[PDB]
Amino acid sequence: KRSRKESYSVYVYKVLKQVHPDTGISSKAMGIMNSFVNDIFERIAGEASRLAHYNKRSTITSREIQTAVRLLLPGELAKHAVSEGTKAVTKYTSA
Amino acid sequence: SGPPVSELITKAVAASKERSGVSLAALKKALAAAGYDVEKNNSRIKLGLKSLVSKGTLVQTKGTGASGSFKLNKK
Amino acid sequence: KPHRYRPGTVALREIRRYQKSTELLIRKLPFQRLVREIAQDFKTDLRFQSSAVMALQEASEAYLVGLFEDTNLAAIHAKRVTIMPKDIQLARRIRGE
Amino acid sequence: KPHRYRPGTVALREIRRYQKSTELLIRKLPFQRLVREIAQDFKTDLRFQSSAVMALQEASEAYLVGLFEDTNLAAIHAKRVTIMPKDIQLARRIRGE
Amino acid sequence: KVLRDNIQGITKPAIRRLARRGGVKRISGLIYEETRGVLKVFLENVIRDAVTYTEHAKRKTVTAMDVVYALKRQGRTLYGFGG
Amino acid sequence: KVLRDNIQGITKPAIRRLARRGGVKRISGLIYEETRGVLKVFLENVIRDAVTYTEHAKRKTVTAMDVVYALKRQGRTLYGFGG
DNA sequence: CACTGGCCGCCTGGAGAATCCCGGTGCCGAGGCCGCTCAATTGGTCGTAGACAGCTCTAGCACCGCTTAAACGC
DNA sequence: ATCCCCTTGGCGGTTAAAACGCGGGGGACAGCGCGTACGTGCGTTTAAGCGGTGCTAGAGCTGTCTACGACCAATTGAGCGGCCTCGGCACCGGGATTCTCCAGGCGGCCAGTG
């Protein structure tokens, strides 16, 4: 066999069927989306690291990454992401 | 209809009489002051300039062709 | 009379068709030969993935597309429809090389 | 008659005098008033260290003088010596903001 | 306490002196107000980022470290204040 | 064995299509040689980074992974081949 | 000086052709199904970082008196 | 140390890639002025700069405590690998429309004349 090589194929397919059940997906577009997930994730992770060390914080919390989102994501995209993440963390803390 | 526009060009260039030649800016605003559709008759004033330079009634001051500035001849 | 189009119209047709085009615009094999050529300028007997040839191909063409869209911005700033090398040179200077 | 230099050479004297100088050309007090005003536009009753105002002052100093040397490059592109604000819009676009 | 018109705090001779440091010989009249505007939007980015850094810190005074840090994450790092 | 000119394999009509993508409508003859020159400069920088990766990988065949890594370092991050 | 005539430059019209626009076909990547195993989670533990009160002091803020440099203007 | 696979090495047919010449035809550009617009020279003013004074906000350090989260063994399950079918699309054939450039008229305008 082969070792399991990890990718974000299934979850982007899940949100794809969630928001457009009738549409399809291609392999090149899926590679683009995996690179997009990796790129945005590493940008936010890097800014979260910088916020962690500038405040001498040993941890990155929702405040840290939330601030990093306000830095990276501009404007209405930023506040919508704040709204989504706040709703998500309230649902998470509601267990 | 009316008179031909070359007469208007000659009176416009003879109205000023600067020590140097008159460029196209002062000429086109002299025609604007006299009253002329200078925006729609660029080709017409170009052929008028070619006719007046080529026939020899008017002499070019320093430019080449219709480019440059123009003065009146010796007589 | 054989039919002939005015200059720029075929050029603008190429503009529209190849902004519409999404494929690779360079012949593959001479680009592969060139990246191997530059490789043996650096390390001897070096090998490439075909996917790496694809990757340098698409990165190279997109980077050049960036330099040329800067070149149109510079050229219309220079009031020219015909670009010159100084447009690309100034774009390289401002881009932070 | 009092002596008068031609238009331009006093400007070049100011040029040469100011690359031989280092002094921060922006007045301290209205810059501090401006940074408090822009900060108050976002979040209220906000205090600035004098070091912060000064540091931001050479920051803005260098940012704009980089923009002006870039627009001088755009002006000598445009066969001009007097820059006009479309040079700045060009520089913003091709720098990528 | 409220301030209204500090865009004109950066005076026209200050702008002329700025462009002297950048090597500009002649400065047209339309330049001053829109350069005030682009200085404004540059500080909107920089100060929004730096103030966001401060409110991350639960501090109330803006520090020079946050100014140079918000500069540095925009690829505009500054030397001379603890960066 | 060795090759001495494949820079011209990125041909004059090929450079014409590339600038047709950028919207360039008229191209003088002087542009093309400098475009291959700056193509050599950029790809030289990228492959310098890439072979430095590759020699650090202790391998002898370049993958696209270190290619997109070098494009990340140079600042022209490429989508489609990450991971 | 008006009247008339002829030619350059636009006005109007019109046909070939590139690319879009109506079907036809076969196929291989795309959507889907199955084994699985590596990983996602759960509970408990340890242990540790940071949130907050206090405080203090110091540097930032609020206020004032001159003085021409700088700003404003022509 | 190995293994097996995608690159490396070599081979045959073809037609688009290119490529170079002709020719039309679109283009940069100096330059001659002109419009105008800041540049510069002053005078005026006034507010920034400088110096001095009182306040206190919060920056920052210290102590407390507790809120929080990696680790780890374990259990399990949902996505990774792999295979496999199938119709949207990749490719193919025939028709409108743009589009566009070219052909013939309209009109302005210059040029000759009673």
From Swiss-Prot, chain A:
Positions where N6-crotonyllysine occurs in the chain: K5
The protein's assembly and partners: The nucleosome is a histone octamer containing two molecules each of H2A, H2B, H3 and H4 assembled in one H3-H4 heterotetramer and two H2A-H2B heterodimers. The octamer wraps approximately 147 bp of DNA.
Residue numbers carrying N6-(2-hydroxyisobutyryl)lysine: K5, K14, K17, K28, K56, K79, K87, K91
Modified residues (N6-acetyllysine): K56
Gene name linked to the record: H2BC12
UniProt-recorded name of the protein: Histone H2B type 1-K
Modified residues annotated as N6-methyllysine in this record: K17, K79
Positions of modified residues (Omega-N-methylarginine): R57, R63
Family according to the record: Belongs to the histone H2B family.
Record-listed N6-(beta-hydroxybutyryl)lysine modification sites: K5, K56, K87, K91
Glycyl lysine isopeptide (Lys-Gly) (interchain with G-Cter in ubiquitin) crosslink location in chain: K5, K91
Modification N6-succinyllysine, positions: K5, K87, K91
Residue numbers of N6,N6-dimethyllysine PTMs: K28
Residue numbers bearing the N6-lactoyllysine modification: K14, K56, K79, K87, K91
Molecular-function annotations in GO: DNA binding; protein heterodimerization activity; structural constituent of chromatin
Residue numbers of Dimethylated arginine PTMs: R50
Positions of glycan attachment: S83
Superkingdom of the organism of origin: Eukaryota
Compartments, record wording: Nucleus; Chromosome
Principal location: nucleus
N6-malonyllysine PTM positions: K87
PolyADP-ribosyl glutamic acid modifications at: E6
Post-translational modification remark: Monoubiquitination at Lys-5 (H2BK34Ub) by the MSL1/MSL2 dimer is required for histone H3 'Lys-4' (H3K4me) and 'Lys-79' (H3K79me) methylation and transcription activation at specific gene loci, such as HOXA9 and MEIS1 loci. Similarly, monoubiquitination at Lys-91 (H2BK120Ub) by the RNF20/40 complex gives a specific tag for epigenetic transcriptional activation and is also prerequisite for histone H3 'Lys-4' and 'Lys-79' methylation. It also functions cooperatively with the FACT dimer to stimulate elongation by RNA polymerase II.
Modified residues (N6-methylated lysine): K87
List of residues that carry Phosphoserine: S7
UniProtKB/Swiss-Prot annotation, chain B:
Protein's name according to its UniProt entry: Histone H1.4
Miscellaneous field: This variant accounts for 60% of histone H1.
Residues of the full protein shown: 36 to 110 of 219
Comment text on domains: The C-terminal domain is required for high-affinity binding to chromatin.
Record-annotated H15 domain positions: 1-74
Localization annotation: Nucleus; Chromosome
Function of the protein: Histone H1 protein binds to linker DNA between nucleosomes forming the macromolecular structure known as the chromatin fiber. Histones H1 are necessary for the condensation of nucleosome chains into higher-order structured fibers. Also acts as a regulator of individual gene transcription through chromatin remodeling, nucleosome spacing and DNA methylation.
PTM text: H1 histones are progressively phosphorylated during the cell cycle, becoming maximally phosphorylated during late G2 phase and M phase, and being dephosphorylated sharply thereafter.
Modified residues (Phosphoserine): S1
Residues carrying N6-(beta-hydroxybutyryl)lysine: K17, K29, K50, K55, K71
Disease per record: Rahman syndrome: An autosomal dominant syndrome characterized by intellectual disability and overgrowth manifesting as increased birth length, height, weight, and/or head circumference.
Source organism per UniProt: Homo sapiens
Swiss-Prot record, chains C, D:
Cell compartment(s), UniProt: Nucleus; Chromosome
Gene Ontology biological process terms in this record: chromatin organization; gene expression; negative regulation of transcription by RNA polymerase II; nucleosome assembly
Keywords: Acetylation, ADP-ribosylation, Chromosome, Citrullination, DNA-binding, Hydroxylation, Lipoprotein, Methylation, Nucleosome core, Nucleus, Palmitate, Phosphoprotein, Ubl conjugation
N6-crotonyllysine: residues carrying this PTM: K20
N6-succinyllysine carried by residues: K20, K43, K86
One GO cellular component term: nucleus
Covalent lipidation (S-palmitoyl cysteine), chain numbering: A74
Modified residues annotated as N6-methyllysine in this record: K1, K20, K28, K43, K86
Modified residues annotated as N6-lactoyllysine in this record: K20, K43
Positions where Phosphothreonine occurs in the chain: T44, T71
Modified residues (Phosphotyrosine): Y5
N6-glutaryllysine PTM positions: K20, K43, K79, K86
Residues annotated with N6-(2-hydroxyisobutyryl)lysine modification: K20, K28, K43, K86
Positions bearing N6-(beta-hydroxybutyryl)lysine: K20, K43, K86
N6,N6,N6-trimethyllysine modifications at: K20, K43
Assembly notes: The nucleosome is a histone octamer containing two molecules each of H2A, H2B, H3 and H4 assembled in one H3-H4 heterotetramer and two H2A-H2B heterodimers. The octamer wraps approximately 147 bp of DNA. During nucleosome assembly the chaperone ASF1A interacts with the histone H3-H4 heterodimer (via C-terminus of H3); this interaction is direct. Interacts with DNAJC9, CHAF1A and CHAF1B. Interacts with NASP; NASP is a histone chaperone that stabilizes and maintains a soluble pool of Histone H3-H4 dimers.
Record's protein name: Histone H3.2
Organism: Homo sapiens
Curated annotation (Swiss-Prot), chains E, F:
Modified residues (Phosphothreonine): T61
Organism field: Homo sapiens
Positions of post-translational N6-succinyllysine modification: K12, K58, K60, K72
Modified residues (N6,N6,N6-trimethyllysine): K1
Modified residues (N6-butyryllysine): K12, K25, K58, K60, K72
Post-translational modification N6-lactoyllysine, affected residues: K12, K58, K72
Role summary: Core component of nucleosome. Nucleosomes wrap and compact DNA into chromatin, limiting DNA accessibility to the cellular machineries which require DNA as a template. Histones thereby play a central role in transcription regulation, DNA repair, DNA replication and chromosomal stability. DNA accessibility is regulated via a complex set of post-translational modifications of histones, also called histone code, and nucleosome remodeling.
Subunit annotation: The nucleosome is a histone octamer containing two molecules each of H2A, H2B, H3 and H4 assembled in one H3-H4 heterotetramer and two H2A-H2B heterodimers. The octamer wraps approximately 147 bp of DNA. Found in a co-chaperone complex with DNJC9, MCM2 and histone H3.3-H4 dimers. Within the complex, interacts with DNJC9 (via C-terminus); the interaction is direct. Interacts with NASP; NASP is a histone chaperone that stabilizes and maintains a soluble pool of Histone H3-H4 dimers.
Effect of Y79H: In TEBIVANED3; results in early developmental defects when expressed in zebrafish embryos
Record's protein name: Histone H4
Record flagged with keyword Nucleus: yes
Mod. after translation: Acetylated as part of spermatogenesis progression prior to histone-to-protamine exchange. Demethylation is performed by JMJD6.
